[PDB]
Design an enzyme around this catalytic site. Sequence first.
Site, PDB file in Angstrom:
ATOM      1  N   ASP A  35       0.827  -1.206   0.000  1.00 10.75           N
ATOM      2  CA  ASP A  35       0.000   0.000   0.000  1.00 10.75           C
ATOM      3  C   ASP A  35       0.876   1.278   0.000  1.00 10.75           C
ATOM      4  OD1 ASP A  35       0.779   0.287   2.694  1.00 10.75           O
ATOM      5  OD2 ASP A  35      -1.129  -0.413   3.516  1.00 10.75           O
TER       6      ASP A  35
HETATM    7  P1  LIG Z   1      -0.699   5.877  -2.019  1.00  7.90           P
HETATM    8  O1  LIG Z   1      -2.061   5.986  -2.695  1.00  7.90           O
HETATM    9  O2  LIG Z   1      -0.216   7.271  -1.576  1.00  7.90           O
HETATM   10  O3  LIG Z   1       0.326   5.340  -3.037  1.00  7.90           O
HETATM   11  C1  LIG Z   1       0.154   4.117  -3.716  1.00  7.90           C
HETATM   12  C2  LIG Z   1       1.252   3.981  -4.787  1.00  7.90           C
HETATM   13  C3  LIG Z   1       0.866   2.829  -5.737  1.00  7.90           C
HETATM   14  C4  LIG Z   1       1.286   5.311  -5.578  1.00  7.90           C
HETATM   15  C5  LIG Z   1       2.633   3.705  -4.148  1.00  7.90           C
HETATM   16  O4  LIG Z   1       2.550   2.482  -3.409  1.00  7.90           O
HETATM   17  C6  LIG Z   1       3.650   3.554  -5.296  1.00  7.90           C
HETATM   18  O5  LIG Z   1       3.979   4.528  -5.976  1.00  7.90           O
HETATM   19  N1  LIG Z   1       4.148   2.340  -5.515  1.00  7.90           N
HETATM   20  C7  LIG Z   1       5.114   2.047  -6.580  1.00  7.90           C
HETATM   21  C8  LIG Z   1       5.968   0.804  -6.352  1.00  7.90           C
HETATM   22  C9  LIG Z   1       6.861   0.875  -5.138  1.00  7.90           C
HETATM   23  O6  LIG Z   1       6.461   0.558  -4.016  1.00  7.90           O
HETATM   24  N2  LIG Z   1       8.095   1.303  -5.404  1.00  7.90           N
HETATM   25  C10 LIG Z   1       9.191   1.468  -4.460  1.00  7.90           C
HETATM   26  C11 LIG Z   1       9.994   0.173  -4.481  1.00  7.90           C
HETATM   27  S1  LIG Z   1      11.489  -0.009  -3.479  1.00  7.90           S
HETATM   28  C12 LIG Z   1      12.652   1.162  -4.120  1.00  7.90           C
HETATM   29  O7  LIG Z   1      12.344   1.889  -5.057  1.00  7.90           O
HETATM   30  C13 LIG Z   1      14.032   1.213  -3.455  1.00  7.90           C
HETATM   31  C14 LIG Z   1      15.165   0.901  -4.402  1.00  7.90           C
HETATM   32  C15 LIG Z   1      16.509   0.864  -3.671  1.00  7.90           C
HETATM   33  C16 LIG Z   1      16.859   2.128  -2.981  1.00  7.90           C
HETATM   34  C17 LIG Z   1      18.232   1.971  -2.310  1.00  7.90           C
HETATM   35 ZN   LIG Z   2      -0.602  -0.330   5.262  1.00  6.95          ZN
END
Ligand SMILES: *P(=O)(O)OCC(C)(C)[C@@H](O)C(=O)NCCC(=O)NCCSC(=O)CCCCC
Ligand SMILES: [Zn+2]
Length: 77
Positions: A35
């Site tokens: 989420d």
């Molecule tokens: P909510 O309604 O505010 O947000 C929901 C979203 C779907 C927008 C949010 O969960 C989102 O943008 N998800 C995209 C996928 C995700 O979780 N990406 C992050 C993954 S981990 C990362 O990027 C770290 C990489 C390494 C860093 C050292």
């Molecule tokens: Zn949660």
Amino acid sequence: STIEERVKKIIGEQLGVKQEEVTNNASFVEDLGADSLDTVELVMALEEEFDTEIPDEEAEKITTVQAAIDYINGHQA
Ligand SMILES: *P(=O)(O)OCC(C)(C)[C@@H](O)C(=O)NCCC(=O)NCCSC(=O)CCCCC
Ligand SMILES: [Zn+2]
Ligand SMILES: [Zn+2]
Ligand SMILES: [Zn+2]
Ligand SMILES: [Zn+2]
Ligand SMILES: [Zn+2]
Ligand SMILES: [Zn+2]
Ligand SMILES: [Zn+2]
């Protein structure tokens, strides 16, 4: 231990998903059920473990386990 194993372990712990479910192709949102807060916490957990900062707009585009592993391999120092 490998980066793949360490990253998968952190994703599973953070999202509350069993290891067998954390496949390289898995989408954090669509497959692993993450989420909005999970995104924030998963990113910070990985930035802390690998001592690297990823811009939030870039992290938003990292949608799968493999993309997270790739970013870490490409940026961890
Ligand atoms: P909510 O309604 O505010 O947000 C929901 C979203 C779907 C927008 C949010 O969960 C989102 O943008 N998800 C995209 C996928 C995700 O979780 N990406 C992050 C993954 S981990 C990362 O990027 C770290 C990489 C390494 C860093 C050292
Ligand atoms: Zn949660
Ligand atoms: Zn090792
Ligand atoms: Zn599950
Ligand atoms: Zn998928
Ligand atoms: Zn930070
Ligand atoms: Zn951030
Ligand atoms: Zn280091």
